[PDB]
């Protein structure tokens, strides 16, 4: 299947209490493999997955240099954003960045990303053509015009179609046993009477990787998405994920309701019925 590599950065200004906190985190699909935290003692890019410890000291030196440099740039970008929006120096602000690439099963480049958010809102994003920018408001439009003039799209395109996909591919090889492992969901159904006239059917998926999954209730072959309590896919803490879907159902009509599970790990669609 398709794979992704993402780096997620968060800078938070803390006026009075020193320079901004910077935290970066790297993922292949739903597996974290590195972190960096400007507040931590180590002052290094740090491993967070077994298969990244393969990389030699030159990798950790070079990766540490690059993320430190990012941290110093986004500390200045926080100051520039203050200026562009005319904000007080008294307040805490957030600059988030995401960048990375997708590859197909063939290992070929599919999609690249390079984008920022200021105070939880879209600031600037590289569009899919990796040639042009979506700028949210008139402040981001200032950065957009500067970045058009300085050919920044061309710079990021070279990273996204080059180092990004080369890195992702090397990681998918070296960590093959982790990253190209599919763990199918372990599924069951519960029944909880509310009364003699209604019951809650809860459909469970446990211990699956990756996180991508569809849990769907049907009543006689028809989607019940408006009536289904669907919780956010959630980490178990061991590298696998958890999800449930619940419907409340007329007592005597349980057999009308089917739970449908789709996961990359399932050879075939699972249909679950209440089988007491």
């Amino acid at each position: 299947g398709s794979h992704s590599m993402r780096y997620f950065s968060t800078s938070v200004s803390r006026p009075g209490r020193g320079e901004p906190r910077f935290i970066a985190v790297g993922y292949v699909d739903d597996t974290q493999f590195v972190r960096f935290d400007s507040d931590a003692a180590s002052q290094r890019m740090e491993p967070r997955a077994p298969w990244i410890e393969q990389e030699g000291p030159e990798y950790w030196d070079e990766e540490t240099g690059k993320v430190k440099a990012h941290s110093q740039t986004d500390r200045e970008n926080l100051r520039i954003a203050l200026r562009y929006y005319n904000q007080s120096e008294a307040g805490s602000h957030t600059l988030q960045m995401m960048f990375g690439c997708d590859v197909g099963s063939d290992g070929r480049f599919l999609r690249g990303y390079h984008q920022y958010a200021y105070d939880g809102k879209d600031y600037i994003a590289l569009k899919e053509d990796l040639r042009s920018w979506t700028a949210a408001d008139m402040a981001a439009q200032i950065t957009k015009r500067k970045w058009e003039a300085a050919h920044v799209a061309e710079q990021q395109r070279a990273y996204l179609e080059g180092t990004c996909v080369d890195g992702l591919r090397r990681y998918l090889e070296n960590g093959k046993e982790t990253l190209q492992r599919t763990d199918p969901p372990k599924t069951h159904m519960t029944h909880h009477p509310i009364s003699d006239h209604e019951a809650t059917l809860r459909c469970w998926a446990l211990g699956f990787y990756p996180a991508e999954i569809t849990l769907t209730w049907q009543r006689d072959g028809e989607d019940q998405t408006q009536d289904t309590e669907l919780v956010e896919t959630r980490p178990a803490g061991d590298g696998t994920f958890q999800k449930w879907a619940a419907v409340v159902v007329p007592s005597g009509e349980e057999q009308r309701y089917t739970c449908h599970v789709q996961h990359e790990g399932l050879p075939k669609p699972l249909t679950l019925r209440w089988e007491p």
Binding site: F8, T10, V12, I23, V25, Y27, Q32, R35, D37, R48, S92, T94, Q96, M98, A117, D119, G120, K121, D122, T190, H192, R202, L206, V231, E232, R234, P235, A236, G237, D238, Q242, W244
Partner: protein, 100 residues
Amino acid sequence: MIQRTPKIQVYSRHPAENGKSNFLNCYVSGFHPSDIEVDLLKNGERIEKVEHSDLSFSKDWSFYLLYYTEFTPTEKDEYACRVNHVTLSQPKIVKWDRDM
């Protein structure tokens, strides 16, 4: 300034069996900004050595964090997650339901 109030789920890693070692998970997601206080409670008291994941965020830029600790569920022990965030008037307590 966009602000988003945390979603909270409290759940075990494994299906709870009374007297068997497990992990208690408080998953806070969908929040902004990133500053957040998360405690795991046993019968209203703060559990000591709680660990959390590295700060990350979703497509929509909202933060998520997993807080977790080893615990041994019993019949009568009540576990909960307490969350404070700038969006909340007062800390929110969500009780662990071993079927949720």
